[PDB]
Ligand binder design. Structure first.
Ligand SMILES: O=c1[nH]c(=O)c2nn[nH]c2[nH]1
Ligand SMILES: O=c1[nH]c(=O)c2nn[nH]c2[nH]1
Ligand SMILES: O=c1[nH]c(=O)c2nn[nH]c2[nH]1
Ligand SMILES: O=c1[nH]c(=O)c2nn[nH]c2[nH]1
Ligand SMILES: [Kr]
Ligand SMILES: [Kr]
Ligand SMILES: [Kr]
Ligand SMILES: [Kr]
Ligand SMILES: [Kr]
Ligand SMILES: [Kr]
Ligand SMILES: [Kr]
Ligand SMILES: [Kr]
Ligand SMILES: [Kr]
Ligand SMILES: [Kr]
Ligand SMILES: [Kr]
Ligand SMILES: [Kr]
Ligand code: NA
Ligand code: NA
Ligand code: NA
Ligand code: NA
Lengths: 296, 296, 296, 296
């Protein structure tokens, strides 16, 4: 036998950082969960009990905290790039660092219509994420995403004209509920290293904001033919707005809301145009995925 | 042996309802999870296999949907009261109905600064809940709550002057992080029946909004001596603002954010006044509870 | 305003303990999650910012670990009783201690048919729990439970003869699936204090084993008329077998498995006697509860 | 813009099947969760609102149930292969089917030492899984796995001789707790189609049983130098025992159990040889991964 692939490190490292403006009193907080996995000349830790090649996972955890102390933690694309670059530069035998960051929302509270200097609310479980792959001699591959953005529209969704055969029971509809949890990922052009990531820093927050705005406005305004057709419109608009993105990927559940026929009970009309009360379905769910890139 | 207590019914009944203004095109959505448990002369279903006394749980589920079709689902205090009253009135041998409702957030989207007529976002996992106990001959007992309201303040929290003995290691602090998930419950005066609940309908949404506003403003502005002292201030303000509330209860975790001593590493200063990077603790957590009522 | 009730402490305290027989090499592990909440003359921590009456939650956490070091952690009824008694005896102004323990399974591995001396498997998420209320001058109230015991039987469950009216759609059945997650609680006679709990120590493990055995054998062998009728049989048998139990409570979901009519597809027969493939329903679920005590 | 990748289908399809031996009365149950995602000439559903190329996700769900009615659901490698083959054969324009199956445990109950004919227990949340990729013209790629197998050993784990630099605080240890949740995957040789999968049917259950037995025995008996070194031993043994496996992958968290220094309290000794009480850590966790194949 031989090791064909290996990576190891620390997962689920919770990190908070505060910035304090001593002049204004305004404080700003950042909270994330971090995973760092390393690759390199480590096969003998697996095959020969050679721990000399292991940077302990506990040490990786200490390094995450030290890196957060000494560097900006925002945008997360930069933090990830700094952290991954640290490992491949510090350790000769470490050749790749895989950094995953989940950013948790801490939105400043408005109290009596004024932003509060040091109080925050978790206004949803929506996340901003990065996957940063720092590979010695191959640069830095960044995927940026938003996830857990839960939305519903009560009309202006349709689904008709699909294939009908002996496996088909679904009725065509010209007016349904559409609800999803948005997972949207944009894949950056390969960066040569940390300097090139630093040169694009303003683009990270701006592209996240664009992706979010395009997703919400497209969902709200598209008279949707299908999840497929609506998600493609979001992806093509994000690509048009950031030339430094190669691809946009959506992964969208179709969280079904079923009509309830109540006609058995006193002739109550609760279907088609009279549909008022629905049964949200926990499972199963449609799952629709696309990766969109630029045409030849 | 004998049955000392019994209740049975349907849990985890997901319900959506849409209101459509045909004149403006504006649609409004409501989504909840409902549990209805019945009590009454049902002991023989347990002791004698006598199913004649059972209103099937499936029938209870149908009744929830039919009730939502025929009645307002808001405020949830009213919906619960209607649903519970239905069971004790319809079935001679059913003497109590216990209705628990969790309301899920569907906040109207603003698109290009204008409220969208039929698109919604789940802006957090914060819930609005009710527990409605409809008891034949004893009226309607309502507890209203907000839950899952996750907040953090980065300063203006203290914890000193607590008991110190041979079990104590905790350092006194004059400046810490305070973060919690707010569970706040207000217990209404007993209502004689559904008519009295209907007579107070406007008070339900207003008291929820007051409870939420008092919680946020008190959390943000109190230079907190303890979770205990801050939560008591919230409870006393809500009681002062709604005479139809008998008690206010808070249940608050103290979600600890620990300082990280980095002085072992190149003399980095990250404690006390220099504390910037913290380790959020998933467990354990403080848990602080109060029920506040009006003084003799 | 005034404090009507208050309790505070530490929740989600994870504890592991190992016993090592130095003579045989056999090691035995115990793992739990502990919550301790205290009550007493603590209202001024809430009303006056008086932290002098607070035994810090951090100190409560230290005390749990110290208590586990100095005392047996099994049976959990004893551990809870020791821990709660410690707080009301040590602190004059603490008058009650509420101790909740969840015990996690670590079952010794059999390797090549021989019990391994120091290797363990989590053979399910079933828990053994206690709720121990130690109240100064009123003794020790213990509820013992098993929870998360997930079972299914594929026949020998029925449900017919229930009430049928204009809300009823459910078909009577003489052969269905029954599946549940068992939550069973036995309430002990009040104990005068820790000495009386110690005097009954062997009864705790034996009564848990009896409750589990009665639940499994009754579920497997009862040709069930209803969840109600089967759970009552379990409760009455446990009461008959331990005179030191006052009540037995079950809380049982009816985790529905729905037939799937496939007759629309090539006349496939998959209902009634031909039912082979079913759709397990995640929600809603029946919820059936009983408390059984001894007859007058 | 253009579609670079697309797949869509139904996720979280819960399926139960019962086998009834009419001669012995013995019933056997199977329960799974299924996801089927299709690929093919479907880009115009995304780009042109052309639903004619969509096999509705609802139809995919019906097909899963119909396939379970007409075919064995065990081993899951076979079921997945049948289901995926159905889609690429039935629909000319569908060129790949991605089938993921999670199998839930329903272990026959022993009542008074005899196997019960129709009663079952969920004896843990451990899963048996498959990922079956059926690709028109490229055959069937199967990954088989076990997951959620939670184990702990109380000694005979070590971790010393790792890299020590200015980021390192971890103490070397010659005797620690090791606990993990096992995720083990074996990748089969490519199969040409469904006939070749059928020709290997007995190997699927046998290889799962081998993987499980090797994992447990290796964990229990290895005096472990590291997670890395122990997992490699498991992988090399599974490869040696099934020539039809190309690779074995483990993904293992190191679920840390920390010593608790109690020496501040009455000089209690609870570290090193005297360590009895530990604090299980929920996060962070080490995460160790290997893919092992056969040497050149
Ligand atoms: O938007 C949709 N896409 C699909 O592919 C589909 N299948 N069923 N319903 C559906 N809705
Ligand atoms: O606000 C607090 N209350 C307490 O009771 C406590 N105990 N430790 N820390 C604490 N913080
Ligand atoms: O066992 C059952 N009890 C009930 O009360 C019930 N209601 N629907 N199905 C049921 N099954
Ligand atoms: O088994 C281990 N492997 C590692 O890579 C490691 N790092 N810290 N502790 C560890 N334990
Ligand atoms: Kr952070
Ligand atoms: Kr969408
Ligand atoms: Kr963008
Ligand atoms: Kr609703
Ligand atoms: Kr608070
Ligand atoms: Kr209020
Ligand atoms: Kr323990
Ligand atoms: Kr039961
Ligand atoms: Kr018992
Ligand atoms: Kr199945
Ligand atoms: Kr391991
Ligand atoms: Kr194997
Ligand atoms: Na390197
Ligand atoms: Na009645
Ligand atoms: Na006392
Ligand atoms: Na095809």
């Amino acid at each position: 036998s031989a090791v064909k692939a290996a990576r190891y490190g620390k997962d689920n490292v919770r990190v908070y950082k505060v910035h304090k403006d001593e002049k204004t009193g305004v404080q700003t907080v950042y909270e994330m969960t971090v995973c760092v996995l390393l690759e390199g000349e480590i096969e003998t830790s697996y095959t020969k009990a050679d721990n000399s090649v292991i940077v302990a996972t506990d040490s990786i955890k200490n390094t995450i905290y030290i890196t957060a102390k000494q560097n900006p933690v925002t945008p997360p694309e930069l933090f990830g790039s700094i952290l991954g670059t640290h490992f491949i530069e510090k350790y000769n035998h470490i050749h790749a660092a895989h950094v995953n960051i989940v950013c948790h929302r801490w939105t400043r509270m408005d109290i009596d219509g004024k932003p509060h200097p040091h109080s925050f609310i978790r206004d949803s479980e929506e996340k901003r994420n990065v996957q940063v792959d720092v590979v010695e001699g191959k640069g830095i591959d960044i995927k940026s995403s938003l996830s857990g953005l839960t939305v519903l529209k009560s009309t202006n969704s349709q689904f008709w004209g699909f294939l009908r055969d002996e496996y088909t029971t679904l009725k065509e509809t010209w007016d349904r509920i559409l609800s999803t949890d948005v997972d949207a990922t944009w894949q950056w052009k390969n960066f040569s290293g940390l300097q090139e990531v630093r040169s694009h820093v303003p683009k990270f927050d701006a592209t996240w904001a664009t992706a979010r705005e395009v997703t919400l406005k497209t969902f709200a305004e598209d008279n949707s033919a299908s999840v497929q057709a609506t998600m493609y419109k979001m992806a093509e608009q994000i690509l048009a707005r950031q030339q430094l993105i190669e691809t946009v990927e959506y992964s969208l559940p179709n969280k079904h809301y079923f009509e309830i026929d109540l006609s058995w009970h006193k002739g109550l009309q609760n279907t088609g145009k009279n549909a008022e009360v629905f049964a949200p379905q926990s499972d199963p769910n449609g799952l629709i995925k696309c990766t969109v890139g630029r045409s030849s």
